[PDB]
Design a protein around this nucleic acid. Sequence first.
RNA 1: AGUAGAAACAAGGCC
RNA 2: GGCCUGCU
Lengths: 716, 735, 93, 249
Amino acid sequence: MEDFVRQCFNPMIVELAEKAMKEYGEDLKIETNKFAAICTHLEVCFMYSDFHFINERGESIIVESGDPNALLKHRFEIIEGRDRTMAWTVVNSICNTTGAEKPKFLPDLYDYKENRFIEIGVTRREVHIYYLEKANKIKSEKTHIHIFSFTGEEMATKADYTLDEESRARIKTRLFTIRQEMASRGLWDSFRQSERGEETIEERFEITGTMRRLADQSLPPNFSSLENFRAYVDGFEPNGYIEGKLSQMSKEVNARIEPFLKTTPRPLRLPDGPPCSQRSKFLLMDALKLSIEDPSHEGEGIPLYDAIKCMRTFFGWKEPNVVKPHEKGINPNYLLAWKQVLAELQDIENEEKIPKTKNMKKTSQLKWALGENMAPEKVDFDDCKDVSDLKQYDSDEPELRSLASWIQSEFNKACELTDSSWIELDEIGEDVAPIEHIASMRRNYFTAEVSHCRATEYIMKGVYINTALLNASCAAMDDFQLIPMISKCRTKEGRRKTNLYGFIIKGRSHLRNDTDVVNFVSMEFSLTDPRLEPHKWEKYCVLEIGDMLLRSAIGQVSRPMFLYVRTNGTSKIKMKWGMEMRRCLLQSLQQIESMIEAESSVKEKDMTKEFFENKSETWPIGESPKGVEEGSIGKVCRTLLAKSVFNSLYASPQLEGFSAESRKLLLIVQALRDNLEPGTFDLGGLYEAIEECLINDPWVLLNASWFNSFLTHALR
Amino acid sequence: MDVNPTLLFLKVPAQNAISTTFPYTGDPPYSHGTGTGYTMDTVNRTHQYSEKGRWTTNTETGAPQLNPIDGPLPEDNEPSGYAQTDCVLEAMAFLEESHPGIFENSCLETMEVVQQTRVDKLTQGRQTYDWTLNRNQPAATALANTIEVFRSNGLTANESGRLIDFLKDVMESMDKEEMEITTHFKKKQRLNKRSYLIRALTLNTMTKDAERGKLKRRAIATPGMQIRGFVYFVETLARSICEKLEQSGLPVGGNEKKAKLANVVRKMMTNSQDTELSFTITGDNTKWNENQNPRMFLAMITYITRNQPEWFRNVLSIAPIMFSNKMARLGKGYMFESKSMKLRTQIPAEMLASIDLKYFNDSTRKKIEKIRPLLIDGTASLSPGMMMGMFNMLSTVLGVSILNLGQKRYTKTTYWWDGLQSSDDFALIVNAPNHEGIQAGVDRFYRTCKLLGINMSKKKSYINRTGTFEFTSFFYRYGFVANFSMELPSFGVSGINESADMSIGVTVIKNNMINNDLGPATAQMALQLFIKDYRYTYRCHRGDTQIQTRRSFEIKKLWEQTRSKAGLLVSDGGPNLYNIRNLHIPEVCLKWELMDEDYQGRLCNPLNPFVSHKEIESVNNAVMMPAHGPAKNMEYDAVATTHSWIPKRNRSILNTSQRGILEDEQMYQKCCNLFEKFFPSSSYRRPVGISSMVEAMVSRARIDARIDFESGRIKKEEFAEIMKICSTIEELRRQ
Amino acid sequence: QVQLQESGGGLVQPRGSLRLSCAAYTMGWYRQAPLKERELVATVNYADPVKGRFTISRDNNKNTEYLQMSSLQPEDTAVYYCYGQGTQVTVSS
Amino acid sequence: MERIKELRDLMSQSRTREILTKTTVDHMAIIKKYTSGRQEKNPALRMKWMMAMKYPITADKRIMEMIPERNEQGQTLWSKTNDAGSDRVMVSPLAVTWWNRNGPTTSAVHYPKIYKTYFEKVERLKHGTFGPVHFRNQVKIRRRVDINPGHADLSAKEAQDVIMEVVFPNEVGARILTSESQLTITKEKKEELQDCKISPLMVAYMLERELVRKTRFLPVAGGTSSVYIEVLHLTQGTCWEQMYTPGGE
RNA sequence: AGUAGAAACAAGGCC
RNA sequence: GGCCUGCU
């Protein structure tokens, strides 16, 4: 039958009908009479629509061939011959522009004169039944319907026929051409009734070929095919198989509970080796401040001018000389770098306006100090294979180092009060609710407690230094840059003040990965002699740069004044995390506020004021040789803030591992102290897990010592 | 006196101050170089936990595979992957018996979803291993490349737009003699059957960074695109199953987890009378993923899909069949340094099979020596067990089956147990009349776990009396206690854009106040610090200050120009009006009545060249990877302002041989923008159909010109011009 | 008497030999190295570090297991137990 | 006119012609998401790192013809170098602030009508009345509650057709909404937003947010009302309760 | 040298 | 010496 559509109809219509065939997903080889019937429907749609044009009037202009002009409007514009999505697109667009009613089924054409749709259907059966059939299929329709049938008859409601009658003679001539051409073909044994509305399909997902063999190799050891295994599974029913293997399984497979008593836990062993060194990016306990007493705010001002003005406030400069060498570098380079920094600072002082940011010369001194041109050149393996020295990067456990007493004192003095306010908080919306007033009062109390704390000063120092370093690295990637360490505080009298700890020289910072390292050299003034705790300054070079006179009742001290100079490095991640050190304030004060709220849930009243003023209640916050010492809530605030600050400063994988594996043991010990009969399956394994995190970090070793002390004081 | 914060625990219980034990204020550990060492170590460890299995050689991939299932029962407490098929089938049968109709229903909804799912659902995924280029690429890019290759090779069933048809094409590709791929350096290369099989069965290994809570780094894996559809269907089934199990806690959030934990502890302890003792085990499973054999997941799913259409069973079984034969790419490689000659070199991992061992240290030398027998075409066969939690939900199903297997109806003894399982972590409440009963119950639970290939970490687990325990960093002490140290890293600028960062910060403060019991004063301090960091990050200072920045001049002139300066946004250098009462209001709407009409109009102008919206999914959704958890998405309330710009892209593609991808990106985006202008609903609802672009665009041009004349700007001259231009593009597409 | 009583330990130069006895089913000799765990040495089967160096034996009439240690090394420096008090073995120069 | 003209210009060049011809409508989404840009793992780090560069943001090409290349002192506002995989050009953040002080102005009176949810929140809070804070232990119990206070009793899909018919009336397709509540919602949001020119996508997104019901599990103590849950952070705490009555009541 | 820690940075590539 | 890139 398909030979007929090969022969007669034009290409355009046959591929339109083929795409309509693909539309609903049925195959053309099984039933083709539908293809012919709907392609004839589509053909009558065209032949009825084309050759029919309109101009600004009604009364369509009919031309056998559209002449070249702007007057190519089509009388009837076709609906079908398009995908369902576009057919409904045209339906909705016509409804929204023509203000007509939206039909629920697919029309075939639209006309302007009568401003409505045409649903053309030419069926094998006579018209006077198919018409009202499709009419009762369509609900309350104003779209006019018109149908032909092979006998040659026409019909329509309203007795309406919308265009010329010679066109309809055309239609029925086409119709009988179709008819008495099948006459030569002979199809009416099924042509009248060949489609009955079949819609059914079964989804087929068959495993075959290579993928089947893979299925045959992904079974238990004693199975040969997926078919057999699935049959076995379907036939499988529970018949007490877990019990049999449990009985047969060796009894050494057990989870015996070892009781956890007061005498069970042993102190954590600390590693032994050379004392632990300093790792901070700046001096914390041994910092010195040169000040100007200016009225500018933290960010307000220009760095270089402030630094120069602060440094001019000090008199007593001496020619620098080596006091304590780096022990691994070239100290003369550090000396020359310091003198170069001074010289270029003067050079800025001379000229017209202090630059906002200064670049330094790339001398051999800072070329060595900043580690320039030291990365091995990257080459290909095929060119370097016979080199005996060629091997992997050194990948082994870090060097072992024992704890020293300097970190303990540094933390002790990091929780001490100061003679300045190191936090100038921002603005918030004016409090409107009583709860907001309570929150503001609490916040004011904590700010009064923690602002005068060395932890806040360290927070500001780190934030400013890391912000400046990151910005300089991102801006001046190539050229070495000078950045004075600046921090602005407010005195007890209320006068604002600036403080200059020293200088940082940032080097080449072409940082691609988050782990890539930018090297800088840090110089900081101090008065602490490095000849008393040399092991804490393994990586520092310390010079003697001047003498300071601070008013004291013992005449006047006239102390020496040294310069701690070192080469340090950071990374994008480290800079970003060090510039978010202000969340240590959060951590600490959230803990304290949780304490206050928990206690106030007992007594139905806010308990902040008496906690902060009466200072009757105290918490164990340290141990003295006499015994455990307790301090007021403010001291707890400062201690927790210092702990968070040191966590942010000495952060490392060792800290995370020890924190987790020691929190586990802390929970076990707490369960013991709560009389909850705690038990363990392998306590030695937990101890070994904790002890492997303690390698060389001073902070984690101090935490381990604190944990041992807590165990000793606990378990009683 | 020496200060010691830990001594604070002598007065404050450990859980009431547990936040102090979370050093989440410093930089988390990161990996620096290759992850090849970790990948090799994981492969060797997975293969040696199942050493007593039986060896075979796949006839298709030619790789050695180790099957430990039904192997000898363990005789020691060391990790073992010798799961027994009959035991696990019985466990699943008991799970079904205790929850009748679970499998049949879940299979019904899964069948509905599979037969109505679309291909585009695969684009909604993070990095995936594209085999066309042998590298990780965004899910959409890899899917597009694979579809292009399939269409070039003759597999065009995916044009039906159905994921099931895409999987049919994927499987049909397995039986092809020779496929063709494209490489740029374009060159057409031919892949034989075995090479393509291994490229479709392989995984890409990387090192996990920003992982807090352990000293050593780990390795993670990413699968290809051929196997992700089957994984999607299997995980859909597993999620539908677990949603019907109250003992599971994987498909829920954190608060639901806490609620279920409280309910189970109350149920276990309350029902226990005075005679019965109760004990809670806070258990962690050692080597959870390395001991879960994909064959056992195949067994579980084929038991689940019993009495179901065979096509459903086949499509759900394809995934574990491929995992059982999965291969893993070793990784980036190894970098060597020579200090004598002062140079460095980078050898790819694919050379580990043949490269001499003189360059490697003792540990790496032994690892390579042990893993070499499993090396096939630069990748190692990893049949014995899963790599990194790809089947999280099925593992949770197995754990829930174990938990339910002790409902006192199967124990047949006075002791019994229950609890909650979330993959790699569990809380087990066991009750028994005497300590001997508790010991026997825990021993039998451990033994049954060892029969299913699941191991309990004795070093990271402990048992106490009920009332105090831990679960996924949630510490329960007669009621869950807030931590607030897990969410600390999320208190900074997110890094999306100005308006997005502001809204996300305020919303995070609000949420942590609601859930994590953040205090009022602490919340105010957090708001102040966040505002300070926000102003210092975006160079948007109050405007009345003299802080010179790269943006302080325009901000200051805008400040001096504005009359009601209280309406200026913090992004434009205005005062901050936020407070505890205003944390749930966008900044634009909070300052709407205070803005000057000129500034208000300039700010919220639709014609601004900065705002760009791509799809309904990416309107106000921000992907923030939370600390100590999987990547998560958040809805943030924000008004589309001129500050909603999107930041610069990487721009490093220009120096790579894969430079033509940018031209293809530009052309695809131009075509997509044209289509959207032709089809405005393209973004909100993704268009569907089987036609091609130009057909729809030209035909809609026809119709829209028509109707927009029937009322609108068009004129006959223009309408006819459009009609004949449509004809022109038609004849152009002809040729 | 007690339940278990190990004896015959002491200080020995590397390469030297020693015989441990214990006064107490299948029995085993275990050792606990300083800082390390209690590990199985032999039973009456030998651990791989032991191999062909130590020889476990038992007198079933006298209720006692014996461990003959030959070609001793500084890794065998540990307290040896049977299954008590234990017996310290120290290998040193 | 224009649209078909850039269509013809695209089809003029062979590569785009092939892309338009061989690519089917269904693959629309795929190729639209086809990109070499990886999703950032650490957005904060790079946002703090990119903002230190010059020209850190991106904007459409049209910015080159509305904003001058430099400001009064000569600080550059935009660059002509396009982004990696787009025709957009990289520009400095000042071009934002500049647009807010001398850029074109419009009538933003209809934004309150569009962003109905946020302005309703503001109005509800502005007329709220606070009360005394009572300090007592709060038994926070976890419950499933609806957060959206303006949901019109419609699901996502249920209101998606309404949203399309309100914004994209022609792409609705087969669906013609039956429920009369949807009829009235369509009428109201059609006549209200008849000429709003913000964007079809944002209008659809905000209509989805407003009409679609959404639910989440939260620890609550009292309240349980939709209006009382949006301020759950302000009314309920660990040991304090703040009586509050939104402006709606 | 320095940062850092089971492998890396201490710029890369292209002419 | 000149120019390109900074998660590809």
